């Protein structure tokens, strides 16, 4: 199972790690992405979770826009976790910037509660430009379920960890 973290609440654990090789060592139930409302994986978590499929999620993602649209700020839609995890459950947090609305950020985490246990980046965090931070602090006040937190950057990890209240 999951190895490494440090528990930081209940049900709250983080580790300084590249979320694609740590879904492809731990193949979880669910991983989340750092999605936007196209599911257009190019950057970010998203970019690095796509190219590890080998751009299978991005083909299953266009058909599910071909089919329903796009997601709303702050939804998410269950997909295929391809060779990563058995689901993808693709989280759109506020982009800030693109001006969008960080008080979304609580509305993204609260789909993390519809599962068990999840392997997640900080939602809103990276190249969506809100403070992970604060992203950290809307997780453990939001979700109640087991979430596993990779933090790629080891600064910003021990940043996260020697400053969470
Ligand atoms: C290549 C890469 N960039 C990130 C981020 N953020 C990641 N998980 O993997």
């Known amino acids: 199972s999951f190895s490494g973290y440090l528990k930081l609440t209940d049900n ?43 751009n299978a999620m991005q083909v299953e993602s ?3 826009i071909a089919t329903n649209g796009p997601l709303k700020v702050g939804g998410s839609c269950v997909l295929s976790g391809h ?32 599962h068990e246990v999840l392997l997640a980046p900080l939602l809103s965090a990276g190249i969506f430009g809100a403070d992970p931070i604060h992203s950290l602090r809307v997780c453990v006040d939001t979700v109640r379920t087991n979430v596993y937190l990779a933090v790629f950057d080891k600064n910003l990890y021990d940043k996260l960890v020697s400053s969470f209240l």
Do not use: M, R, W
């Not at 879904?23 to 690095?48: D, E, F, S």
């Not at 910037?97 to 950020?105: R, Y």
């Open 12 to 54: 709250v654990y983080i580790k300084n790690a590249d979320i694609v090789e740590e879904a492809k060592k731990v193949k979880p139930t669910v991983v989340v992405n750092a999605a936007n409302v196209y599911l257009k994986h190019g950057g970010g978590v998203a970019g690095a979770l796509n190219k590890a499929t080998n």
């Open 83 to 114: 060779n990563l995890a058995k689901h993808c459950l693709h989280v759109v947090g506020p982009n800030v910037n693109k001006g969008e609305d960080i008080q979304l950020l609580k509305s993204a985490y609260e789909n993390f509660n519809q």
């Open 62 to 64: 266009d058909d599910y």
